C-alpha cells in the first residue's frame, strides 16, 4: 500500500543530492562560508537595526477574496520610485542609495541599513550572474549576455522577519510531511520573466527534516508525487532561484524554532509600477485639459471617444493602483522615509484634477445641442471605466473597514483616502457613483 512519495528529502538522505541534480538543478545554494564575515556583520546589524526601529510590518493582504494579515513582517527596500505588487498589495520602496539619489531624511541608522542591503544587492547580483554563466556552460556542453545581466538586475529586496515564539500560529505542510510553514507553497509573482531571485537567510541562534531549523521547501508545480526538497538554512546561507525555477516549481518556508530574517532580492516587473511611469500617465490624461491656470473650471480640448476612455482609465489607475494602495497601508513607511510624501501629494492633486475632468465629461453628455449619436459614443467610451471605478471604491471602503483592519495599531490602521462626504463642496462629484452610472445606462437603452 505504498505510493508516489508523499515524502521529502533532506541532506540526511542518500537520494537528496541526486534528486537535487536531476529535478531542481536551477536551485543554487551558497553556504554562509562563501560570504565574507564583514559583510555578514553589516547585514545582520542592518536587520536588527530595522527591527528595533519598528520598520517591518505585517501586510493586510488579500487571497481568494479574504482579508488576511500575514504572520511574517516585511519591508520593501529598493530603487527610488519603484513598487512591487503581490497578493493585491502594492508595496512602495523604502529607497536605497542608487546613484544620483536624493538623500530624503530618514532615521539615523535606517539610511545606513538601506545602504547595507544595497551592498548585499551588488554582491548577490555578481554571484547570480556568475551562476547563470556556469549554468549556460553546462547547457552548451551537453546539448545573450544581456539576458543574463537583466535577469540578475535586482531592483528591490523584500525583507521578512518571523519570531515563531511570538507568532505560533503556523499551518502544517500538507503534501510531504515538512511540518510547520511560515510561508505556504507559492510562486513569487510579478517578476521579470525568467529572472533570478536571491535570498540571504539569517536564523538567530530522527525521521525527516529537523523542526528546530529553518528550511526552504521546493516542489514541482502540479506535482506532489515527486518528493519535495527541504533545504536547511542557517546563519547567513544564501539560495538562488535561477531562470525558469520560480515558474516551474513552488517554494515554501518551513519554520524553525528561533526567530529569523531573510532578504529576498528580485527583479520586479515594474513597467506600470514606477513613480515616473504613473506621473507620465497622469500628464497624458491631462493633455486633454486646458492648463493655463489651476482652478475648478476644468475645460476639455476634445470629446473624442478614445481620448475620454483613456482619461477615465488613467483616472482609475492613479486612484486605485496608487493612492488607495498607499493609504490603505496607513502610512507606515512614513516611519522609515518621507520619499513618497510629496510624490503622493502630487498624485493626489493630479487625481483631483481628474475628478474635475470626469465632471466636465458628465456636463458635456447632458448638453442641450448634442446629437444623441455623439452622446452615445461618449457613454459607450466611458461607461466601463465609471462602473469599474464604483465597484473598486465599494471594495476599498470595505477593505479599509474589515473587522481585521480595525484591530491594527494606530501606526498602521488603513486610511480610506481619498474620501469625502456628500456634503463636501470641495469635491465636484460624489464618492458614490451608483446614481450617475445608472443614469448613463438608462440613456444608452433609450429609444
Ligand atoms: O523568506 C524567504 O526565505 C522567502 N520569502 C519568500 O519566498 C516570499 N515571497 C513572496 Cl512573493 C511572498 C509573498 C507573500 C507571502 C510570503 C512571501 C514569501 O515568504
Ligand atoms: Zn517566495
Q: Which ligand has the minimum distance to the alpha carbon of residue 250?
A: 2
Distance 188 CA to ligand 2 centre (A): 5
C-beta 188 within 6 A of ligand 1: yes
> What's the rounded Cα separation, in Å, for the pair 69 and 59?
6
> What's the rounded Cα separation, in Å, for the pair 294 and 353?
9
> What's the rounded Cα separation, in Å, for the pair 206 and 72?
28
C-beta 183 within 6 A of ligand 1: yes
Atom of ligand 1 nearest to the CA of 87: 14
209 labelled ligand-binding: no
Distance 262 CA to ligand 1 centre (A): 9
Distance 274 CA to ligand 2 centre (A): 22
Distance 165 CA to ligand 1 centre (A): 19
Distance 181 CA to ligand 2 centre (A): 12
C-beta 63 within 6 A of ligand 1: no
251 labelled ligand-binding: yes
Residue 247: how many other CB atoms lie within 10 Å: 14
CATH code, residues 275-408: 1.20.58.1470
What's the per-residue H, E or C state across the chain?
CCCCCCCEECCCCHHHHHHHHHHCCCEEEECHHHCCHHHHHHHHHHHHHHHHCCCCECCEEEECCEEEECCCEEEEEECCCEEEEECCEEEECEECCCCCCCCCCCCHHHHHHHHHHHHHHHHHHHHHHHHHHHHHHHHHHHCCHHHHHHHCCCCEEEEEEECCCCCCCCEECCCCCCCEEEEEEECCCCECCCCCEEEEEEECCCCCCCCCCEEEEEEECCCCCCCEEEEEECCCEEEEECCCHHHHEEEEEECCCCCEEEEEEECECCCCCEHHHHHHHHHHHHCCECCCCCCCCCCECCCCHHHHHHHHHHHHHHHHHHHHHHHHCCCCHHHCCCCCHHHHHHHHHHHHHHHHHHHHHHHHHCCCCCCHHHHHHHHHHHHHHHHHHHHHHHHHHHHHHCCCHHHCCCCCCCCCCCCCCCCCCCCCCCCCCHHHHHHHHHHHHCC
Q: Which of 217, 253, 262, 263 to mutate to test the pocket of ligand 1 (most atoms within 8 A of CB)?
A: 253
Which residues make beta-bridge pairs with 91? 84
160 labelled ligand-binding: yes
C-beta 241 within 6 A of ligand 1: no
> What's the rounded Cα separation, in Å, for the pair 274 and 293?
28
> What's the rounded Cα separation, in Å, for the pair 121 and 138?
26
Could you state, in order of their start, the residue ranges of all structural domains in the chain? Answer: 8-274, 275-408
Residue 220: how many other CB atoms lie within 10 Å: 15
State the structure-solving technique: X-ray
Breaks in the chain listed by the residue before each, with C–N > 2.5 Å: 143, 205
Nearest to 322 by CA among 270, 274, 358: 274
Atom of ligand 1 nearest to the CA of 266: 11
Residue 184 grid coordinates: 505556504
C-beta 86 within 6 A of ligand 1: yes
Atom of ligand 1 nearest to the CA of 189: 11
> What's the rounded Cα separation, in Å, for the pair 414 and 348?
17
> What's the rounded Cα separation, in Å, for the pair 296 and 285?
17
C-beta 59 within 6 A of ligand 1: no
C-beta 160 within 6 A of ligand 1: yes
80 CB-contact burial (10 Å; exposed 0-12 / middle 13-18 / buried 19+): buried
Distance 252 CA to ligand 2 centre (A): 7
241 CB-contact burial (10 Å; exposed 0-12 / middle 13-18 / buried 19+): buried
Cβ atoms of 68 and 184 closer than 8 Å: no
CATH code, residues 8-274: 2.60.120.590
Residue 30 grid coordinates: 551558497
Nearest to 359 by CA among 415, 428, 436: 428
331 labelled ligand-binding: no
Nearest to 308 by CA among 344, 345, 354: 354
Residue 377 grid coordinates: 459614443
In the chain, how long is the greatest CA-to-CA distance?
85
Nearest to 201 by CA among 231, 159, 229, 236: 236
> In angstroms, what is the resolution?
2.5
CA angle 310, 311, 317 (to 5 degrees): 90
Amino acid at each position: 500500500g505504498l505510493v508516489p512519495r508523499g515524502s521529502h528529502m533532506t541532506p540526511k538522505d542518500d537520494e537528496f543530492y541526486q534528486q537535487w541534480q536531476l529535478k531542481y538543478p536551477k536551485l543554487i545554494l551558497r553556504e554562509a562560508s562563501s560570504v565574507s564575515e564583514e559583510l555578514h556583520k553589516e547585514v545582520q546589524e542592518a536587520f536588527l537595526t530595522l527591527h528595533k526601529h519598528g520598520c517591518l510590518f505585517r501586510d493586510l493582504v488579500r487571497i481568494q477574496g479574504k482579508d488576511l494579515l500575514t504572520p511574517v513582517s516585511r519591508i520593501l527596500i529598493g530603487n527610488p520610485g519603484c513598487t512591487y505588487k503581490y497578493l493585491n498589495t502594492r508595496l512602495f520602496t523604502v529607497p536605497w542609495p542608487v546613484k544620483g539619489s536624493n538623500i530624503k531624511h530618514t532615521e539615523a541608522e535606517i539610511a545606513a541599513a538601506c545602504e547595507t542591503f544595497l551592498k548585499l544587492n551588488d554582491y548577490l547580483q555578481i554571484e547570480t550572474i556568475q551562476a547563470l554563466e556556469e549554468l549556460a556552460a553546462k547547457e552548451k556542453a551537453n546539448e545573450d549576455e544581456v539576458d543574463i545581466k537583466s535577469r540578475a538586475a535586482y531592483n528591490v529586496t523584500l525583507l521578512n522577519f518571523m519570531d515563531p515564539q511570538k507568532m505560533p500560529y503556523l499551518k502544517e505542510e500538507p503534501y510531504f510531511g515538512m511540518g510547520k510553514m511560515a510561508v505556504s507553497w507559492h510562486h513569487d509573482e510579478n517578476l521579470v520573466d525568467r529572472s533570478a531571485v536571491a535570498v540571504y537567510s539569517y536564523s538567530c541562534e530522527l525521521e525527516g527534516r529537523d523542526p528546530d531549523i529553518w528550511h526552504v521547501g521546493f516542489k514541482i508545480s502540479w506535482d506532489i508525487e515527486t518528493p519535495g526538497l527541504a533545504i536547511p538554512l542557517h546563519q547567513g546561507d544564501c539560495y538562488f532561484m535561477l531562470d525558469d525555477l520560480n515558474a516551474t516549481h513552488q517554494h515554501c518556508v518551513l519554520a524553525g524554532s528561533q526567530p529569523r530574517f531573510s532578504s529576498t532580492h528580485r527583479v520586479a516587473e515594474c513597467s506600470t509600477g514606477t513613480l515616473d511611469y504613473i506621473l507620465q500617465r497622469c500628464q497624458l490624461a491631462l493633455q486633454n485639459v486646458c492648463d493655463d491656470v489651476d482652478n475648478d473650471d476644468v475645460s476639455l480640448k476634445s470629446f473624442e471617444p478614445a481620448v475620454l476612455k483613456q482619461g477615465e482609465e488613467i483616472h482609475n489607475e492613479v486612484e486605485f493602483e496608487w493612492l488607495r494602495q498607499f493609504w490603505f497601508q496607513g502610512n507606515r513607511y512614513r516611519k522609515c522615509t518621507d520619499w513618497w510624501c510629496q510624490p503622493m501629494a502630487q498624485l493626489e492633486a493630479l487625481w483631483k484634477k481628474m475628478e474635475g475632468v470626469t465632471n466636465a465629461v458628465l456636463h458635456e453628455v447632458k448638453r442641450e445641442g448634442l446629437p444623441v449619436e455623439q452622446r452615445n459614443e461618449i457613454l459607450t467610451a466611458i461607461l466601463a471605466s465609471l462602473t469599474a471605478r464604483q465597484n473598486l471604491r465599494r471594495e476599498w471602503h470595505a477593505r479599509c473597514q474589515s473587522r481585521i483592519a480595525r484591530t491594527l495599531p494606530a501606526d498602521q490602521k488603513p486610511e480610506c483616502r481619498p474620501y469625502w462626504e456628500k456634503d463636501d463642496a470641495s469635491m465636484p462629484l460624489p464618492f458614490d457613483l451608483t446614481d450617475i452610472v445608472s443614469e448613463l445606462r438608462g440613456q444608452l437603452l433609450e429609444a
